[PDB]
Amino acid sequence: AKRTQKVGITRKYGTRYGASLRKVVKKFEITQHAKYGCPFCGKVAVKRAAVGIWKCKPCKKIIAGGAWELTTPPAVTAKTTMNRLKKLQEEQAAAAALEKKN
């Protein structure tokens, strides 16, 4: 049984608010009610508890997430780039400290 064509979870809003608005919302809502894979126990049990707060039922970990997601792309980006910059910091200082021997 396929119960809705366009609407899905948005159907609760019935006919209110206008289409495009509850498109935007279909999107977000499906994000927040989705189960996420826990980094720690590797189960896809992680659900959102509060706005910024996610829990994994089985492994009992709570992580600071984004509002509607577990993972905020700009935050992942900041991790990726923090690391890369760590590499460069250390490589640089450590390398030219050998020049300090002169």
């Binding site: 706005v51 910024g52 709570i62 600071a64 509002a67 509607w68 905020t72 935050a75 460069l88």
Partner: protein, 257 residues
């Protein structure tokens, strides 16, 4: 000769008085221990909870007191990705990792930061909002200056010795989901000083507000009000340099550059 709502917000006996019963603690940094200036102190995330007025989660952090047997609890701002039971490191030598707290001068250019300090030992000032981050632009050679790029996008020079959290404030994106119902707006504003709902100044009679004109509902006097406008005078867009929406001649932002 009535008193607008504009004015009624500065009254402390008043109706507009924050609803504080839910507040867990101020979210600030560690005290400025010797340990933090010359070394690193480590603590645990006992939990990250939700404060009722806050978009950003709060982290509850256990620290061992340097001078006694007591165990110190403190509440920090959630850096996105921090886990309950994480080890958080604060101080001079603390290394760069999500949620650790260093001086900015030790943080590499281009890095993303939270809860920066305006004066050294703020226990935090800048970029506390959910999802907010500040951008690290440059360091002076001396080490005493750092250029930060604030969420608003204005650049600021801060003593490099100031405390910063590596990473981004948690719970970002909430601002993006449209609020459909009015009730939502209601509950939300229920935990903060009441701003809701907002009655347009024109709905009102000349007694309740400079705007409410009368028979037609218009402002009828220029709504750009000068910075020096007296208490009950200051109503429209204040001290505004521009008014309209810029459509069309947007190439001007570029050609003007």
């Amino acid at each position: 000769g009535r008193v607008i709502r504009a004015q009624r917000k500065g009254r402390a006996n008043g109706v507009y008085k924050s609803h504080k019963s839910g507040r867990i603690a101020p979210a600030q940094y560690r005290v400025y221990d010797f340990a933090e200036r010359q070394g690193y102190i480590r603590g645990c995330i006992r939990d990250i909870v939700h404060e009722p007025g806050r978009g950003a989660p709060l982290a509850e952090v256990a620290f061992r007191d340097p001078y006694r047997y007591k165990t110190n609890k403190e509440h920090f701002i959630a850096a996105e990705g921090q886990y309950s039971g994480q080890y958080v490191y604060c101080g001079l030598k603390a290394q760069i990792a999500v949620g650790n707290v260093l001086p900015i001068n030790r943080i590499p250019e281009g890095t993303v930061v939270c809860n920066v300090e305006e004066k050294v030992g703020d226990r935090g000032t800048f970029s506390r909002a959910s999802g907010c981050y500040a951008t690290i632009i440059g360091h002076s050679e001396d080490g005493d200056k750092t250029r930060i790029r604030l969420p608003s996008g204005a650049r600021k020079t801060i003593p490099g010795s100031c405390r910063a959290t590596v990473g981004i404030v948690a719970g970002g994106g909430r601002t993006d989901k449209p609020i459909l119902k009015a009730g939502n707006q209601f509950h939300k504003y229920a935990r903060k000083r009441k701003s809701w709902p907002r009655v347009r100044g024109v709905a009102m009679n000349p007694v309740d507000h400079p705007h409410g004109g009368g028979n037609h509902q218009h402002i009828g006097h220029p709504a750009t009000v000068s910075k020096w406008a007296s208490a009950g005078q200051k109503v429209g867009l204040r001290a505004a340099r521009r008014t309209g929406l810029v459509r069309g001649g947007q190439k001007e932002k570029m050609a003007m550059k």
